[PDB]
């Protein structure tokens, strides 16, 4: 099946240890994005990649096993299509006014206050977000939503966490 | 008075807006580590700097005002002093065996599960941690411990957070 193929492909990306490290992820992502110059990016930095890996590293192995990578890549795949969808002026970046729509298109519904901070943390002087920031932001936003939901259950919508867990969730991200 | 002197120095570092942006911080920092070869590092990445800024940007202006910069810098110079203390073999980096001591020195008492995650997120392939990773890691750790406290009545040991707060805390970091 299509999956068995990705499994086969993951094996080429994983290398001997069968997991994708932050370094491998960086080179892989940069080898892919360079082949799509229409995606404006300064490239995925090693720092951003350690953060993406850590946030996806549910089983804390320091690298990404098959399932994590697949989840990550499926997300990038989908978000990459949305990125193109919302780069309406074909500038290679997601303008600030197009951003809420793109996030919504990714299934994210925030508010003026979140978007403002998102922009602040992920956009350039002009309110524009390039490809690596867009992807890294969503990987993080998705991971943080799942973290909350998982820590919740089926209602409340207001989790409690001690210092051990707080540092876990924040330092390893 | 040092603050007055530092204030006059800061002015030369902030510029037009009177605050230090992530890009400005990165440059100041890299120009400084450059003047210190004994400090192994491949420079502070832009994403790392954006993360440090956000985490330090208590008043959410997007950039570092004097007080935030002064706080950050006082921590870096002091943590930098600790860094050199624990680079026993003058490797330019901190050994994994020496890392727990370097941290304790910085005043951080985390261990077992916690620590391992830190190493995993900031150490090199051999467990060694370089300067930018060491500094960035502590800046974040400091920020997180502090962020936790500021959300506690009398330190019941736990904080309750809703979705907006969680995303604010984790996305703007």
């Amino acid at each position: 099946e299509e999956v068995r193929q990705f499994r086969r492909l993951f094996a080429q990306l994983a290398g001997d240890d069968m997991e994708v490290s932050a370094t491998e992820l960086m080179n892989i992502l940069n080898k892919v994005v360079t082949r799509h110059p229409d995606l404006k990016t300064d490239g995925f930095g090693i720092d951003t990649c350690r953060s993406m890996v850590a946030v996806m590293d549910s089983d804390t192995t320091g690298k990404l096993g098959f399932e994590e990578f697949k989840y990550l890549w499926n997300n990038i795949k989908k978000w990459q299509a949305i990125y193109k969808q919302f780069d309406v002026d074909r500038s290679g970046t997601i303008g600030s006014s197009e951003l809420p729509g793109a996030f919504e298109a990714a299934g994210f519904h925030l508010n003026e206050h979140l978007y403002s901070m998102i922009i602040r943390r992920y956009s350039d002087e002009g309110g524009n977000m390039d490809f690596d920031n867009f992807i890294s932001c969503l990987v993080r936003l998705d991971a943080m939503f799942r973290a909350f939901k998982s820590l919740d259950k089926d209602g409340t919508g207001q989790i409690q966490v001690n210092i051990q867990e707080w540092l876990q969730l924040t330092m390893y991200s | 008075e040092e603050v007055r002197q530092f204030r006059r120095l800061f002015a030369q570092l902030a510029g037009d807006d009177m605050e230090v942006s992530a890009t400005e911080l990165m440059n100041i920092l890299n120009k400084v580590v450059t003047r210190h070869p004994d400090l192994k590092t491949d420079g502070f990445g832009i994403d790392t700097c954006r993360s440090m800024v956000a985490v330090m940007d208590s008043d959410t202006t997007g950039k570092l005002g004097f007080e935030e910069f002064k706080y950050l810098w006082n921590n870096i110079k002091k943590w930098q002093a600790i860094y050199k203390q624990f680079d026993v073999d003058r490797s330019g980096t901190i050994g994994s065996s020496e890392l727990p001591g370097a941290f304790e020195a910085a005043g951080f008492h985390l261990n077992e599960h916690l620590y391992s995650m830190i190493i995993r997120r900031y150490s090199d392939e051999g467990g060694n941690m370089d300067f930018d990773n060491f500094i960035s890691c502590l800046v974040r750790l400091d920020a997180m411990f502090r962020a936790f406290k500021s959300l506690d009545k009398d330190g019941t040991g736990q904080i309750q957070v809703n979705i907006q707060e969680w995303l604010q805390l984790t996305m703007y970091s």
Partner: peptide, 5 residues
């Protein structure tokens, strides 16, 4: 990856 309100 979803919702706020």
């Amino acid at each position: 990856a979803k919702a706020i309100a």
